[PDB]
Symmetry: none
Subunit: 164 residues, 2 copies
């Protein structure tokens, strides 16, 4: 039920990477007319619910270094985060939670949550002193306790809006 | 039934102007908790349904200069549009159709549909050449026949998502 407006300069492969699925399996499969990329038209992304049915909404502020979880347009919890360096920034715009994996370990800490930009996610950390700072390669980092909490709550498909 | 998360710096008048309602009524009358407005809280906007009960969804691509109308996440109609000039751009994000006026005339042509940002709408045109171009003060323009058709189908409250 998740529908994605293919933007200009999207290829089929960059869309499949962003959403962590294959170019065939449904991408072409879910969308039959995929017979030439079409900027401004809409395709479905097979594994995910319609994100407007998920009453959760995550809002990231790069400047304030906060991630805020809302439920039905009321903020519920706000957490401190690390964000990307000035030369390796966290990207702005509209994303979704795609995937998760518990206890990846290393610099990814207690949890990974994929965002709908290839190679980007929200994750924990084994460098807790880094939270609150512009320090990362582009991912949003959280104290382990908070990412565990966030992952416990939000389903795949949840909207993540990132602003400066 | 339509809810809204109060943003930092929202005032009663600023919210009222975006949703084309008055300050007292409907706005204080609906949220009685408005003896003080607080960032992060939920208020209801009177005069409009929950957008999730409307099975239509409009998606606008600024780059591609298209407006798509979908029903239960299948595309029904695709239209060419004019959009804002590069110094007077059509804003991005989530809006709603608030209200409408048939045959406003002048540069607004056959129909005006208010969006949920003050002074922005989707409308027709008496300058048909403008369609498909980045030429507007910020509104989305359509051919008169197309805005008539769009209006004939989608109700007030319909989600309008605008992407670059």
């Amino acid at each position: 039920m998740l529908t994605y407006q293919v933007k200009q300069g999207d290829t089929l492969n960059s869309i499949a990477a962003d959403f962590r699925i294959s170019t065939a399996a449904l991408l072409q499969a879910n969308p039959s007319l995929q017979a030439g990329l079409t900027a401004g038209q809409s395709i479905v992304i097979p594994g995910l619910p319609d994100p407007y049915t998920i009453p959760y909404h995550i809002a990231v502020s790069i400047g304030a270094k906060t991630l805020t979880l809302s439920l039905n347009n009321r903020v519920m919890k706000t957490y401190p985060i690390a964000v990307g360096k000035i030369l390796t920034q966290t990207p702005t715009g509209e994303f979704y939670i795609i995937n998760r994996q518990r206890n990846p370990g290393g610099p990814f800490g207690a949890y990974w949550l994929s965002l709908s930009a290839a190679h980007y996610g929200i994750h924990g950390t084994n460098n807790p002193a880094s939270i609150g700072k512009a320090v990362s390669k582009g991912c949003i980092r959280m104290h382990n306790k908070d990412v565990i909490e966030l992952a416990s709550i939000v389903p795949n498909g949840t909207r993540v809006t990132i602003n400066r």
